[PDB]
Homo-oligomer: A and B are copies of this chain.
Amino acid sequence: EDLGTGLLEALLRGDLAGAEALFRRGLRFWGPEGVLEHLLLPVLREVGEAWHRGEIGVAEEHLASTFLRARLQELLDLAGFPPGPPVLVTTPPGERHEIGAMLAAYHLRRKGVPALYLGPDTPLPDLRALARRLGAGAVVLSAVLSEPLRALPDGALKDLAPRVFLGGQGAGPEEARRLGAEYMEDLKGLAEAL
């Protein structure tokens, strides 16, 4: 697992070419899904750990996250966008971590589901209005922090779309039930739940 360390080290020195080359190598080794699990995700977690310990600053994290977000968006577009009633994917209001939402939309598209990624931080009434107008079959929410969920009143997610899914590190079964959403433990079960 040299690639994880090397990719991080390449990004931290502002070597985009080297970072890109290391990521492509991961894609070659593990394929699209594999490179997320073994490279993109571990690096994102380590970046958070390094910042938390004071080993790197915010600007370093920004650089790494922006790079990896660009790579995931590539895979997202590579997965394609099929016809039919879309599934809207975003994060609850106040939640600015968006890569979990992108990841969810990615796994849905891989299964032929037209997951529309909106970006993060969408007000619930606006989310519901879009879902209604596009005739969206479902809404998917990624919660990394728990406070944006705790800030919501009971039943807040209930009427967003015919089906409403909630997951992420910030989400739990008890909280999803309170908000009126279906809890999904992992991305594996999310794709099959539809």
Interfacial residues, chain A to chain B (CB-CB below 8 A): 13-14, 16-17, 20, 24-25, 27-32, 34, 57-60, 62-63, 65-66, 69-70, 73-84, 86, 88, 90, 109-114, 116-119, 121-123, 125-127, 129-130, 134, 191
Q: Is the CB of A27 within 8 A of B24?
A: no
**25 sample A-B contacts, Cβ–Cβ < 8 Å, listed by A number:** A13-B134, A14-B134, A20-B77, A24-B34, A27-B29, A27-B30, A29-B32, A29-B78, A32-B78, A57-B129, A58-B126, A62-B121, A63-B130, A66-B119, A69-B119, A73-B73, A73-B74, A78-B79, A80-B82, A80-B109, A81-B110, A81-B111, A82-B112, A83-B191, A84-B112
The 6 closest A-B pairs by CB, nearest first: A82-B112, A80-B80, A66-B119, A57-B126, A59-B130, A58-B126
Tell me the complex Cα distance, A127–B61, Å: 11
Which residues of B lie under 8 Å from residue A121 when comparing CB positions? 62
Which residues of B lie under 8 Å from residue A29 when comparing CB positions? 27, 32, 78
Q: Is the CB of A58 within 8 A of B122?
A: yes
